[PDB]
């Protein structure tokens, strides 16, 4: 419940949860991180659209999407096109992990 692989989505009001941090993409577009329930950070895009959703792009970029797919917000950072993983940690940082480095099977090791 605390990970979100690239191509996946956190629908409206859905959240990631790790330990005591809850990162929620609210329906009205503001991504909010709580700690035990009290807000502590937020993308400050409340009202910027509605039926909002958070998604991790295949190039590691993180973007909040409108229900009309407008790009409300975004981590504005992209690396090689591949597959990434956003993980909310038990310390509150929600991090995006570079493209895939290893995996079992035939090529599965970008070096």
């Amino acid at each position: 419940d605390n990970v979100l692989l690239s191509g996946q989505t956190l629908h409206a009001d859905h959240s990631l949860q790790a330990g005591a941090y809850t990162l929620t993409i609210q329906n009205k577009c503001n991504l909010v991180k709580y700690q035990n329930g009290r807000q502590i950070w937020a993308s400050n895009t409340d009202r910027r659209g509605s039926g909002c959703r958070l998604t991790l792009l295949s190039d590691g970029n993180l973007v909040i999407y409108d229900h009309n797919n407008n790009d409300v917000w975004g981590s504005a950072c992209w690396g090689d096109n591949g597959k990434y993983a956003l993980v909310l940690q038990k310390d509150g940082r929600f991090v995006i992990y570079g493209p895939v480095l290893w995996s079992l099977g035939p090529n599965g090791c970008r070096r």
Binding site: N2, V3, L5, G60, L62, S75, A76, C77, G79, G82, K83, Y84, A85, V87, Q89, R93, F94, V95, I96, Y97, G98, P99, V100, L101, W102, S103, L104, G108, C109, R110, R111
Partner: protein, 111 residues
Amino acid sequence: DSVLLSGQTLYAGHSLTSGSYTLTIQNNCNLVKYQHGRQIWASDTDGQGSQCRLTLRSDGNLIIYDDNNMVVWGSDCWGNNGTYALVLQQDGLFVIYGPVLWPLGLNGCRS
């Protein structure tokens, strides 16, 4: 948890978990992925030491150490130094995601 990040370590008996998948680094030193009871893959390092632990290097390398702190097994796939994340996914694959890409510090992007 379904994530192990660089610097963390799973000791014997420990496992990541996700839905029906479970990746356990066993007392007998064998790193084994299961699906509901059934075994699907292993490093085949059973009885290759006891008290083994699975840790993820700072360079993304996945390694098994034993009783005497000797590398019993590894993935031998590493990249630049920083933080990595090994995540056991809902499709049952365990992937190790490249170095950190965006919250570099506050809001930093490795280019």
